Design a protein around this ligand. Structure first.
Ligand SMILES: C[C@H](CCC(=O)NCCS(=O)(=O)O)[C@H]1CC[C@H]2[C@@H]3[C@H](O)C[C@@H]4C[C@H](O)CC[C@]4(C)[C@H]3CC[C@]12C
Length: 305
């Protein structure tokens, strides 16, 4: 009946899923206590009924991308360029909109390696590799501007359409996947944030969809953990199915036999918990996927993984 459209998950195996916090495929499922850290990502956030939260948007190639025009080079460091940002879909950025930053803006501290490209009205073009430092005092996307750094010191034009394509980490300096940038810079609080998430029942931990992103030099697992894959967010946005309780019970199922491997709790706020203790990667059957079973409550006791 009206108000009771059945909730569903898309039929997608792990090799058919994308990270919602960096534009790469999912590599594995992962669980960890993250004891003492506040888990509050702003990309990859949606309710189960299809309301996108934080800085989350639908287009996979706009995750961690920037668009705008360069108004000036920094006089005393010609490696630095001031980018006046627009939205990644091309529309002007309205700082009065009730979001933390332009949709798709990176949600973690890092030196992000990527490429800055331009095309002029006469179709002359240029591109140069470089670094987006999301920890810099000049990373102020909510105010409309960020700094780009490049090895190139001359061949970028002012007042021409510009895009930043992210590739990975440049190095590990300042890298912390759970530390949010200060979107308006020094001494100013972030606004309109999606809330932090945590397990709320003893014996449970968050379950993440993990990718190991590229690193240009150094030592790191490159781990970026998202709460929901991008395809699930895209599915819920189209379906708009109401949530009648706080938690959907989901089961990882092999479709050819019906055998169920393990179960988990999918919370209406858009994250997963499992009964497990300790940090561990999981291996799933390549042909399996999560399926909706029933609606339960916050206090339902799961079978341990
Ligand atoms: C402009 C960026 C942030 C600088 C910053 O805010 N520093 C802090 C100033 S304060 O002490 O807080 O006042 C810096 C951080 C990393 C820098 C880059 C990296 O060091 C790698 C590259 C090094 C090359 O010598 C120049 C280009 C190269 C690509 C740099 C350009 C400028 C970057 C991108």
């Amino acid at each position: 009946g009206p108000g009771s459209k059945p909730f569903t998950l898309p039929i997608l195996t792990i090799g058919e899923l994308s990270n919602s916090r960096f534009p790469v495929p999912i590599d594995e499922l992962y669980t960890s206590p993250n004891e003492g850290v506040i888990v509050q990502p702003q990309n990859g956030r949606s309710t189960l009924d299809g309301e996108l939260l934080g800085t989350t948007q639908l287009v996979p190639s706009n995750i961690c991308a920037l668009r705008g025009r360069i108004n000036a080079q920094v006089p005393d460091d010609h490696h630095q360029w001031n980018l006046q940002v627009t939205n990644t879909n091309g529309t002007p950025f309205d700082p009065t909109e009730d979001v933390p930053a332009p949709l798709g803006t990176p949600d973690f501290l890092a030196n992000i390696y990527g490429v800055t490209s331009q095309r002029n009205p006469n179709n002359t073009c240029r591109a140069h590799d470089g670094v987006l430092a999301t920890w810099s005092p000049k990373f102020t996307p909510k105010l409309g501007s960020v700094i780009l750094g490049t090895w190139e010191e001359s061949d970028l034009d002012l007042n021409q359409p510009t895009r930043f394509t992210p590739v990975g980490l440049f190095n590990t300096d300042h890298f912390d996947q759970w530390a949010l940038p200060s979107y308006s810079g020094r001494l100013t609080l972030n606004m309109n944030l999606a809330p932090s998430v945590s397990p709320l029942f003893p014996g449970e931990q968050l379950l993440f969809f993990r990718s190991h992103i590229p690193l240009k030099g150094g030592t790191s697992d490159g781990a970026i953990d998202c709460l929901l894959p991008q395809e699930w967010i895209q599915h819920f946005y189209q379906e708009s199915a109401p949530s009648p309780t706080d938690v959907a019970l989901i089961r990882y199922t092999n479709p050819d036999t019906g055998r169920v491997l393990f179960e988990a709790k999918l919370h209406r706020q858009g994250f997963i918990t499992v009964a497990n203790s300790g940090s561990r990667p999981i291996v799933v059957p390549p042909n399996g996927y999560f399926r909706f079973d029933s609606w339960v409550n916050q206090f339902y006791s799961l079978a341990p993984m």
